[PDB]
RNA sequence: UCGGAGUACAAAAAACCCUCCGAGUGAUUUUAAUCUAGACAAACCAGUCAAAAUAACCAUAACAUCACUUAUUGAUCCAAAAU
């Protein structure tokens, strides 16, 4: 079992990306992070795969 | 006064036979001769010490050096193109006037400051003039018409309180070298060239009336001057009613370097005469 | 007498006289706020942290450059700064240069008058100390509820 | 370090030092932490903050870098809008 | 309370304030080692820049 | 190369081609912010903690947890990606 590193972009329109380690067999991940640009919790979705 | 001169009458005459250097001025040299400095001469015993083949400076013996394991960042990125301004404090400006180094009767600009040994400008080291700082704004009681290359809000307010005039002008390094050292330029036998325009980066600074820019619209100066007077709570003097209004209103054309001189003029210092061109193309080029 | 295509006369044709830049347009701003000639300005320098204390003192009752409703609202809100003799005292300690200290006092005085001048200006706020102040005030009203003949 | 050059005979400088160090007029040198751009997802929030901070160099490192650069970089510079302009001079140093 | 000092006691009202001790800092070293750039700001006397001979 | 126990009996440090265990990652969601006093550690490079303050959300909310929890990792340059 190998994990995948994916970059998540904010859904608030601001440009903010933080990488998160994810299991390969899992589907697309969607979290609730906290971007300082808007100073409020906003939805984050998986955008790109960078490292395995 | 010099009571030691009385002692010299009794002592013999001073000649080359009896002269001694000041004690301690010449430390003696140590040569590698004798038991002490001998058989090793202060080098060591074997290795790269005694044979003089130690590595370069900053090499830690195969290990990555300290100056190579630090990531590059731009601290001196483009430093050779950043503009530098020599600071002039109002404490020093007051000091120069009190000692007669400069005079407020005559208009003061960068040239008069250099001749007064107030500030030294090196055009080669990317110096674009003198900036006025507000270190001595509280004790500034002089009334001058000073022209600098950069000014602060408090420095301008302090001068305008006494009834002075502050104006900021831009000088190209080609022109600034001529301005700071006029006499050496006049000995090069070349016509006075036009002063170049500020670059696109420095246009807003010299165009706004808040900085008293030389290229600013004069109609907005009186309203900008009163804003400073209101802000700092000092009554704005009526400069037009002073007897030195003609001197205080003197300015320079943006294409002009010195007071009363024009581009294209050749100063023949030997004959104390000024030469002027006559051709239409020469006059147009030096006046456009 | 030298003129070029970049001269001020040829760049701004509307204003050409050299006396234009030194006029005094008193008519443009006739409000004449803060007539500092009637304000008592005192400077006290403390050298050791070096700062210049600049204080502005004036009589609130006789200050005729403010309206009557504004004059009394200053006393209601800023009654903590009012001296015994009715002299409103404002003090600054921010900058070392006394020019900036006096400028800060004038700007602070403008804000005091500006917010008090507007009848509709009545902002409110909630603070951490406001919560306990309300609670300690509510608690002392519990004991006050008894109503029997007093002295 | 070339103590004596073959063209003018003066003392050369090492361009590696200037590209990654800043010299304040007080003698202190400034540098970035090593590894402030590598594997950020792996490091904690506190560790990333520590690596993003400017740091000073001790006496031996400061003395070493003064013998590797010429005297042009030790001059007093008055830059316009320089963030480090206020850090040039030392103050209240009781040694 | 204010009227008591003025009308009754004929006294200028004294006003106090709660003053905390100043923050503690270590002795300043000539060459700070692995310290942030803000190390100089702790021992600064005033934020107004002070020019010397200039 | 990195961690734990003994050698190293009671502050720290302390070696061997010395004696025994491990690590070169998984599981889960509580997805873990910004800024700064003072310190441990250390040749250097690195590593660690951390009050106050600000924002987040019970509207006066910062330790991600578990597996001996301790180790689960790599400096510049350079290259690629949105910056
Ligand atoms: K010897
Ligand atoms: Mg010797
Ligand atoms: Mg010798
Ligand atoms: Mg011998
Ligand atoms: Mg031998
Ligand atoms: Mg040997
Ligand atoms: Mg090797
Ligand atoms: Mg210089
Ligand atoms: Mg220690
Ligand atoms: Mg806290
Ligand atoms: Mg290399």
Which domains are present in chain A? Answer: 1-48 (2.20.28.120)
- Cα distances (Å, whole numbers) of residue B134 to B33, B92, B268, C89, D83: 63, 11, 41, 28, 19
Does D51 reach chain E within 8 Å, measured CB to CB? Answer: no
- Cα distances (Å, whole numbers) of residue C41 to B88, C46, C91: 29, 16, 10
> Which residues, numbered 24 to 53 in chain E, qualify as contacts with chain C under a Cβ-Cβ cut-off of 8 Å?
45-46, 48
Q: Residue B33 falls within a domain, yes or no?
A: no
- Cα distances (Å, whole numbers) of residue B201 to B204, C7, E24: 7, 21, 45
Q: What strands, in cross-sheet order, belong to the sheet with A40-51? A: A17-23, A3-10, A40-51, A30-35
The protein residue nearest F35 (Cα–C1') is D49
C-alpha torsion angle, residues C48, C50, C52, C53 (rounded to 10)? -70
- Cβ contacts of C49-52, under 8 Å, gap ≥ 24: C49/E45, C49/E46, C50/C96, C50/E45, C50/E46, C51/C93, C51/C95, C51/C96, C51/E46, C52/B138, C52/C95, C52/C96, C52/C97, C52/C98, C52/C101
Q: Is residue C81 a contact partner of residue C57, using CB atoms and an 8 Å limit?
A: no
Q: Residue B108 falls within a domain, yes or no?
A: yes
Task: Give the integer Cα–Cα distance in Å for B63 and B171.
Answer: 51
Chains adjacent to A (≥3 CB pairs closer than 8 angstroms): D
Q: Residue B69 falls within a domain, yes or no?
A: no
Task: Give the integer Cα–Cα distance in Å for C33 and B255.
Answer: 42
* Residues of B in Cβ contact (< 8 Å) with E53: 92
Does C49 reach chain E within 8 Å, measured CB to CB? Answer: yes
Tell me, in Å, how far CA of A29 is from C1' of F34?
A: 26
Task: Say if A and C touch: at least 3 Cβ pairs within 8 Å.
Answer: no
Q: Write the residue in D27, D59, D92 that is nearest to E43 by C-beta.
A: D92
How many domains, chain B? 1
Task: Give the integer Cα–Cα distance in Å for A36 and A16.
Answer: 9
Q: What strands, in cross-sheet order, belong to the sheet with B150-151? A: B84-89, B127-133, B150-151
Distance from the alpha carbon of residue B69 to the mean position of ligand 7, in angstroms: 14
Q: Is residue C116 a contact partner of residue C73, using CB atoms and an 8 Å limit?
A: yes
What domain range includes position B277? 81-288
Chains adjacent to D (≥3 CB pairs closer than 8 angstroms): A, B, E
B188 is in an annotated binding site: no
> Residue B120: closest CA among chain E residues belongs to which residue?
E54
> Which residues, numbered 3 to 32 in chain E, qualify as contacts with chain D under a Cβ-Cβ cut-off of 8 Å?
27-28, 30-32
Q: Do C15 and B217 touch (CB under 8 A)?
A: yes
Bases on strand F under 7 Å from any protein CB: 25-28, 31-39, 41-50, 55-57, 60, 62, 64, 73-78, 82-83
DSSP E strands: which ranges in chain B?
84-89, 127-133, 145-148, 150-151, 165-168, 266-268, 273-275
Number of H helices, E strands in chain E: 2, 0
Task: Give the integer Cα–Cα distance in Å for C10 and B285.
Answer: 17
Expressed in angstroms, the distance from the first to the final Cα of chain B is 66
Task: Give the integer Cα–Cα distance in Å for E43 and D91.
Answer: 7
Residue B193 corresponds to which tokens in the numbers above?
């060239």
* Radius of gyration for chain B, computed over Cα atoms and rounded to the nearest angstrom: 30
Residues 6+ apart with CB under 8 A from C4: B194, B253, B254, B255, B256, B287, B288, C10
Q: Do B84 and D79 touch (CB under 8 A)?
A: yes
Does E7 reach chain C within 8 Å, measured CB to CB? Answer: no
CA quadruple C75, C80, C82, C85: dihedral sign: positive
Q: Output the CA angle B214-B220-B223, nearest 5 degrees.
A: 125
Q: Residue B35 falls within a domain, yes or no?
A: no
Q: Is residue B176 a contact partner of residue B128, using CB atoms and an 8 Å limit?
A: yes
Resolution for this PDB entry, in angstroms: 3.5
Does D2 reach chain B within 8 Å, measured CB to CB? Answer: no
Q: Residue B189 falls within a domain, yes or no?
A: yes
Task: Give the integer Cα–Cα distance in Å for B148 and B146.
Answer: 7
Q: Residue B39 falls within a domain, yes or no?
A: no
Determine which helix (DSSP H) or strand (DSSP E) holds C141, and give its type and residue range: helix C128-144
Q: Residue B142 falls within a domain, yes or no?
A: yes
Name residue, tokens 């240069």: C97
Q: Write the residue in D16, D35, D75 that is nearest to B67 by C-beta.
A: D16
Q: Residue B64 falls within a domain, yes or no?
A: no
B122 is in an annotated binding site: yes
Does D81 reach chain E within 8 Å, measured CB to CB? Answer: no
C-alpha torsion angle, residues E27, E29, E30, E36 (rounded to 10)? -120
Q: Write the residue in C84, C95, C97 that is nearest to E6 by C-beta.
A: C84
Task: Say if C and E touch: at least 3 Cβ pairs within 8 Å.
Answer: yes
Best A7, A17, A19 member to test D by mutation, with max D CBs in 10 Å, is: A19
In this structure, the number of other CB atoms found within 10 A of the CB of residue B238 comes to 12
Residue B164 corresponds to which tokens in the numbers above?
């002075």
The protein residues having their C-beta less than 5 angstroms from ligand 4 (an ion) are B 39
In this structure, the number of other CB atoms found within 10 A of the CB of residue A3 comes to 13
Residue A12 corresponds to which tokens in the numbers above?
């608030």
Q: Do E51 and B87 touch (CB under 8 A)?
A: yes
Distance from the alpha carbon of residue D12 to the mean position of ligand 11, in angstroms: 20
Q: Do A5 and D41 touch (CB under 8 A)?
A: yes
Task: Give the integer Cα–Cα distance in Å for B258 and E6.
Answer: 69
Ligand approaching nearest to the C-alpha of E33: 9
Distance from the alpha carbon of residue B64 to the mean position of ligand 11, in angstroms: 8
């Amino acid at each position: 079992s190998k994990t995948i590193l994916v970059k998540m972009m904010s859904q608030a329109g601001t440009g903010f990306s933080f990488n998160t380690k994810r299991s390969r067999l899992r589907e697309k991940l969607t979290l609730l992070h906290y971007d300082p640009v808007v100073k409020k919790k906003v939805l984050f979705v998986e955008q790109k795969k960078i490292r395995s | 006064g010099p009571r030691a001169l009385d002692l010299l009458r009794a002592l013999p005459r001073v000649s080359l036979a009896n002269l001694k250097p000041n004690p301690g001025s010449r430390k003696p040299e140590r040569r590698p001769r004798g038991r002490r400095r001998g058989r090793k001469c202060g080098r060591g015993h074997k290795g790269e010490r005694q044979r003089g083949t130690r590595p370069r400076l900053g090499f830690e013996g195969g290990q990555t050096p300290f100056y190579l394991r630090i990531p590059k960042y731009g601290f001196n990125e483009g430093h050779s193109f950043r503009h530098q301004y020599q600071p002039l404090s109002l404490n020093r400006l007051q000091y120069l006037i009190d000692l007669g180094r400069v005079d407020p009767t005559q208009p003061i600009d960068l040239t008069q400051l250099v001749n007064g040994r107030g500030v030294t400008i090196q055009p080669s080291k990317r110096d674009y003039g003198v900036q006025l700082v507000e270190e001595g704004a509280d004790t500034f009681k002089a009334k001058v018409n000073i022209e600098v290359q950069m000014a602060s809000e408090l420095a301008i307010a302090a001068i305008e309180k006494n009834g002075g005039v502050v104006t900021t002008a831009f000088y190209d390094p080609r022109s600034l070298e001529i301005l700071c050292k006029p006499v050496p330029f006049f000995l090069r036998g070349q016509p006075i060239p036009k002063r170049m325009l500020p670059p696109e980066a420095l246009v807003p600074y010299y165009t706004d009336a808040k900085n008293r820019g030389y290229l600013a619209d004069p109609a907005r100066f009186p309203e900008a001057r009163l804003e400073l007077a209101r802000k700092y709570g000092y009554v704005l003097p009526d400069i037009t009613k002073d007897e030195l209004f003609k001197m205080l209103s003197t300015r320079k054309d943006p294409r002009q370097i010195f007071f009363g001189l024009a581009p294209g003029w050749v100063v023949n210092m030997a004959d104390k005469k000024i030469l002027k061109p006559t051709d239409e193309n020469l006059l147009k080029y030096y006046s456009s | 007498e030298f003129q070029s295509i970049y001269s001020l006369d040829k760049l701004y044709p509307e204003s050409r006289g050299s006396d234009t830049a030194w006029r005094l347009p008193d008519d443009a701003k006739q409000a004449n706020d803060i007539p500092v000639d009637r304000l008592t300005i005192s400077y006290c320098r403390s050298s050791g942290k070096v700062n210049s204390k600049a204080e502005v003192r004036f009589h609130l009752a006789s200050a005729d450059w403010i309206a009557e409703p504004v004059r009394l609202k200053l006393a209601v809100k800023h009654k903590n700064r009012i001296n015994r003799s009715g002299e409103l005292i404002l003090t600054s300690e921010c900058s070392r240069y006394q020019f900036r200290n006096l400028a800060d006092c004038l700007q602070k005085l403008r804000d005091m008058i500006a917010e008090a001048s507007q009848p509709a200006k009545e902002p409110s706020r909630e603070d951490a100390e406001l919560r306990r102040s309300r609670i300690e005030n509510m608690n002392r009203e519990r004991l006050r509820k008894k109503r029997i003949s007093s002295a | 370090v070339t103590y004596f050059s073959s063209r003018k005979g003066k003392r050369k400088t090492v361009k590696a030092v200037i590209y990654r160090f800043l010299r304040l007029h007080s003698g202190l040198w400034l540098r970035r932490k090593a590894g402030y751009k590598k594997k950020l997802w792996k490091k904690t929030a506190a560790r990333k903050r520590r690596l993003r901070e400017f740091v000073f160099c001790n006496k031996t490192q400061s003395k070493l870098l003064d013998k590797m650069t010429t005297s042009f970089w030790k001059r007093r510079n008055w830059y316009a809008d320089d963030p480090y302009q206020k850090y040039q001079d030392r103050t209240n140093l009781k040694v | 309370v204010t009227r008591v000092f003025h009308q009754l006691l004929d006294m200028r009202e004294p006003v106090f304030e709660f003053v905390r001790p100043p923050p503690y800092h270590p002795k300043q070293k000539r060459f700070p080692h692995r310290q942030p750039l803000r190390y100089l700001d702790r021992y600064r006397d005033s934020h107004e820049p002070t020019y010397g001979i200039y």
